[PDB]
Design a protein around this ligand. Sequence first.
Ligand SMILES: C[C@]1(Cc2cn(-c3ccccc3)nn2)NC(=O)C[C@@H]1O
Ligand SMILES: [Zn+2]
Ligand SMILES: [Zn+2]
Length: 197
Amino acid sequence: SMLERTINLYPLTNYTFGTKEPLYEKDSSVAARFQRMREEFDKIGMRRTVEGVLIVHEHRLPHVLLLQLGTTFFKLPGGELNPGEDEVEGLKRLMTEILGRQDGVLQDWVIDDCIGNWWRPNFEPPQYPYIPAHITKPKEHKKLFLVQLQEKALFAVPKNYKLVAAPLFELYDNAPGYGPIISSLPQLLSRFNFIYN
Ligand SMILES: C[C@]1(Cc2cn(-c3ccccc3)nn2)NC(=O)C[C@@H]1O
Ligand SMILES: [Zn+2]
Ligand SMILES: [Zn+2]
């Protein structure tokens, strides 16, 4: 009757947030983003993205780590898989590219839980937690995973990003602020048995 996954959380003060060089988006605009998605869909088919949910606490209040591009949009650490690339190896690679240390010490990502799937039916912003009716060729499949952090770690945050710890209450029913994936993380995380270390 204990059917919940147990996840260790550590205080945000256990983590060091260093800095490194800016990491630029492949796309300079929404228009270029959907143009490249169109181009790549014709060459290699559906885009496969992976995103990591990294959780900490302060004073037993869980917080999700988000990347803020300057003071603009909020994203999860993650990105695009290469064709034939394993989802979990790919998320580990992407989280190393974004948050990995300037001193090149190997970081230990633990990924054991899928927490959701989102599908983009068109070359347009809307994403859904299912393949919508009549859609046979979704343009993007996004996979979210829970990343179990170590007790302590040093992260290097690209100088053009801020790493922000968002409490769940701030995400909850805040799609305008965070969009439909990040704003549904409180619901998606509720099944876990968090231990506040
Ligand atoms: C994740 C977002 C925002 C967003 C809005 N919608 C949505 C869903 C249903 C109906 C109308 C809008 N889905 N995702 N999509 C992007 O392309 C980047 C941005 O972060
Ligand atoms: Zn406390
Ligand atoms: Zn799919």
